[PDB]
C-alpha cells in the first residue's frame, strides 16, 4: 500500500465536515501520497493516480446548464478516465448525475425494488410537479398515487436549500408548494429514521430522529416547512421530532434487506460511497427508502476513517 498514489477533488465544505485533511494525513503515514487535485491543470500533469475520490456533483450541475468553465472541467476528467482505465474512480460520474436528481433517484429505487421482488421493501408514490394546475391540482396527483399528506422536496438533491421541504396536509395547503419540485407520499414511521452509510462493502446503520406521526388522509393542519438535515441531525429537538405515541408496526430494520439493497445499488450505479435513508412503514411494516445520498457527510459515524482506508485498500487489491 506504500507508494500508492491517490488524488481527490472535494469541496472545502465536504472536506471540513468529513475532516478530510486529517484523513489525508492519516493515509500519508500509511505510506501513500495524497494529492489535492488542481482542476486548473490537466490532470495528466498530476499523475499517475491509482485512485481518484471525488464529489463533483456541483460542477456536474453547472456543466449541464451550459457553463463553459464546468463543461471544460468535466471534459478533462472524463478524457483522463478513458486514457486511464486502471485508475479507480470513487465514484463513477453517471452515478453522480443519477443521485443529484431526486426524480431519477426515486425512479431508480422503484426499479431496484421490482428487481429484488421482496415484499419487505416499498417506495412511497412520487411524481415531479413542474407547475401547479389550478383548483383541481389533486386529481393530477391522485393519478400518480399520491394522497394527503405528502412532502414537497427540491428536484435537485444538492446545494443550498435542497434540504428545505414542506409537508402538505389538505387542499388549503397546496399554496405551500413551490414548483418545480418533487412530491412524495408521507409515510408514518414513528419518528425514527435509519440512515445507512455505505463505504464499499462495510455499512453502518445510524438511528436518527425524524418526523412524528400524523393522521392518515386529510387533516385540518397547516402546512409545515422544515429542514430535513436539521430535523434528522444526530440530534434535533423539534416540535416535529417529539413523537406522540407508538402507532402501528414498530420493528427494527431487517439486516438482510439493507445488505441486499446496498448490493443492488452498487451493481446498478457502480457507486461505493453513498447513504440510504430508510423508514419503517408503521402501516405495513415494510422498508421505505425515501432518499439516496451520494458520498454523504458520515456525520459522527463510528469508525468511518478506518472503513475508508480498508475500502481504498480493497479496490487497490483488484
Ligand atoms: N415520505 C416520507 N415520509 C416520512 N418522512 C420522510 C419522507 N421523506 C422524507 N422524510 C424525512 C425523514 C426525516 C425528516 C423527513
Swiss-Prot record:
Cysteine-cysteine disulfides: none
Outcome (variant: residue 159 to A/P): Loss of kinase activity
Residues that, per the record, bind ATP: 102, 153, 184-195, 210, 228, 232
An MF annotation (GO) of this entry: inositol-1,3,4-trisphosphate 6-kinase activity
Post-translational modification: Acetylation by EP300 and CREBBP destabilizes ITPK1, and down-regulates enzymatic activity. Deacetylated by SIRT1.
Cellular component annotations (GO), alphabetically ordered: apical plasma membrane; cytosol
Entry note: cofactor: Binds 2 magnesium ions per subunit.
Summary of the tissues where the protein is detected: Expressed in brain > heart > skeletal muscle = kidney = pancreas = liver = placenta > lung. In brain, it is expressed in cerebellum, cerebral cortex, medulla, spinal cord, occipital lobe, frontal lobe, temporal lobe and putamen.
Keyword Hydrolase: yes
Effect of residue 163 to A/Q: Loss of kinase activity
Cofactor: Mg(2+)
Limits of the ATP-grasp domain: 113-318
Catalytic activity: 1D-myo-inositol 3,4,5,6-tetrakisphosphate + ATP = 1D-myo-inositol 1,3,4,5,6-pentakisphosphate + ADP + H(+); 1D-myo-inositol 1,3,4-trisphosphate + ATP = 1D-myo-inositol 1,3,4,5-tetrakisphosphate + ADP + H(+); 1D-myo-inositol 1,3,4-trisphosphate + ATP = 1D-myo-inositol 1,3,4,6-tetrakisphosphate + ADP + H(+); 1D-myo-inositol 3,4,6-trisphosphate + ATP = 1D-myo-inositol 1,3,4,6-tetrakisphosphate + ADP + H(+)
Residues the entry annotates as binding 1D-myo-inositol 1,3,4-trisphosphate: 14, 163, 195, 293
Amino-acid positions noted as binding Mg(2+) 2 in the UniProt annotation, renumbered to this chain: 291, 293
Effect of residue 293 to D: Induces a strong reduction in kinase activity
GO biological process, one term: neural tube development
Residue ranges of the TM segments: none
Purpose of the protein: Kinase that can phosphorylate various inositol polyphosphate such as Ins(3,4,5,6)P4 or Ins(1,3,4)P3. Phosphorylates Ins(3,4,5,6)P4 at position 1 to form Ins(1,3,4,5,6)P5. This reaction is thought to have regulatory importance, since Ins(3,4,5,6)P4 is an inhibitor of plasma membrane Ca(2+)-activated Cl(-) channels, while Ins(1,3,4,5,6)P5 is not. Also phosphorylates Ins(1,3,4)P3 on O-5 and O-6 to form Ins(1,3,4,6)P4, an essential molecule in the hexakisphosphate (InsP6) pathway.
Assembly description: Monomer. Interacts with GPS1/COPS1.
UniProt name for this protein: Inositol-tetrakisphosphate 1-kinase
Section covered of the full-length record: 5 to 322 of 414
Amino acid at each position: 500500500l506504500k507508494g500508492k498514489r491517490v488524488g481527490y477533488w472535494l469541496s472545502e465544505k465536504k472536506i471540513k465536515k468529513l475532516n478530510f485533511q486529517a484523513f489525508a494525513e492519516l493515509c500519508r503515514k500509511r505510506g501513500m501520497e495524497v494529492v489535492q487535485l488542481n482542476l486548473s491543470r490537466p490532470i495528466e500533469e498530476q499523475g499517475p493516480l491509482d485512485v481518484i475520490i471525488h464529489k463533483l456533483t456541483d460542477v456536474i450541475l453547472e456543466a449541464d446548464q451550459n457553463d463553459s468553465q464546468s463543461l471544460e472541467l468535466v471534459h478533462r476528467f472524463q478524457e483522463y478516465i478513458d486514457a486511464h482505465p486502471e485508475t479507480i474512480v470513487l465514484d463513477p460520474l453517471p452515478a453522480i448525475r443519477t443521485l443529484l436528481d431526486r426524480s431519477k433517484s426515486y425512479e431508480l429505487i422503484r426499479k431496484i425494488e421490482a428487481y429484488m421482488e421482496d415484499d419487505r421493501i416499498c417506495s412511497p408514490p412520487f411524481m415531479e410537479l413542474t407547475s401547479l394546475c389550478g383548483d383541481d391540482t389533486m386529481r393530477l396527483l391522485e393519478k400518480n398515487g399520491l394522497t394527503f399528506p405528502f412532502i414537497c422536496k427540491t428536484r435537485v438533491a444538492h446545494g443550498t436549500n435542497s434540504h428545505e421541504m414542506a409537508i402538505v396536509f389538505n387542499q388549503e395547503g397546496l399554496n405551500a408548494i413551490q414548483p418545480p419540485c418533487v412530491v412524495q407520499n408521507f409515510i408514518n414511521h414513528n419518528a425514527v429514521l435509519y440512515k445507512v452509510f455505505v463505504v464499499g462493502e462495510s455499512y453502518t446503520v445510524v438511528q436518527r430522529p425524524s418526523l412524528k406521526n400524523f393522521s392518515a388522509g386529510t387533516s385540518d393542519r397547516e402546512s409545515i416547512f422544515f429542514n430535513s438535515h436539521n430535523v434528522s441531525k444526530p440530534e434535533s429537538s423539534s416540535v416535529l421530532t417529539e413523537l406522540d405515541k407508538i402507532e402501528g408496526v414498530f420493528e427494527r430494520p431487517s439486516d438482510e434487506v439493507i445488505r441486499e439493497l446496498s448490493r443492488a445499488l452498487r451493481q446498478a450505479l457502480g457507486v461505493s460511497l453513498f447513504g440510504i435513508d430508510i423508514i419503517i412503514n408503521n402501516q405495513t411494516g415494510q422498508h421505505a427508502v425515501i432518499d439516496i445520498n451520494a458520498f454523504p457527510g458520515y456525520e459522527g459515524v463510528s469508525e468511518f476513517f478506518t472503513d475508508l482506508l480498508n475500502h481504498i485498500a480493497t479496490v487497490l487489491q483488484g
